[PDB]
Structures are given as structure tokens and as C-alpha cells.
Amino acid sequence: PTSLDVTSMTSWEYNWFGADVIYIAKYYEVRKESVDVISYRHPITGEIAT
């Protein structure tokens, strides 16, 4: 079944008739993570490449 987010924000002085709306949210995070970089150092056509 569908469970929607609750905000109690709108309907403030407005007539509501459509109960066929479900509220979905997109959530963003920024994280600092450990990643391993591989340095392909083939001399042909530039050498330093990480």
C-alpha cells in the first residue's frame, strides 16, 4: 500500500476534493568516502593519468 509524507502545510483556506495524490520525496546526501585511484602511466600519448 501507499504511505505518503505528511506536512500539514497546504489546505490553509482552500477547498480540497482530490484524495488521489501521494507525496513522495527525493533525498540527497553528501558523504566523504575512501576511494582508491589507479595511475595508468603508459608513456605513449601522455603518461600521468590518474
Binding site: 500539514s8 489546505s11 480540497w16 476534493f17 482530490g18 484524495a19 488521489d20
Partner: protein, 52 residues
């Protein structure tokens, strides 16, 4: 100033009201709907049963 929403069920709109009593510390909710019936002409309907 009462929290509310709108719900539907096969083309019928229902209002939900959420309100609470502070000293009792109780949360309560209710749903409402108000119908209205008319009868245009009684000579255009009835009950039919299988005759013997």
C-alpha cells in the same frame, strides 16, 4: 484552523478532520459525508420477481 485532508473512494470525496484535547492528551479523528436523495417519478421503477 483544524488539520484536515481529502480522500477519495470510487468517485466519492470524504473529509478527514484531526483534532486533540490538551488536558486529556488524547488525539482523535473523524470522517464525514452528507448524502441527499430525490425521487423524480415513482412510476418508473419497482421490484420484479419470477412469475410462476
Amino acid at each position: 484552523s483544524i488539520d484536515s485532508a481529502v480522500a477519495t473512494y470510487e468517485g466519492f470525496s470524504i473529509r478527514v478532520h484531526k483534532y486533540a484535547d490538551g488536558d486529556a492528551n488524547v488525539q482523535k479523528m473523524r470522517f464525514d459525508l452528507l448524502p441527499a436523495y430525490v425521487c423524480f417519478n415513482p412510476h418508473m421503477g419497482g421490484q420484479f420477481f419470477g412469475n410462476p
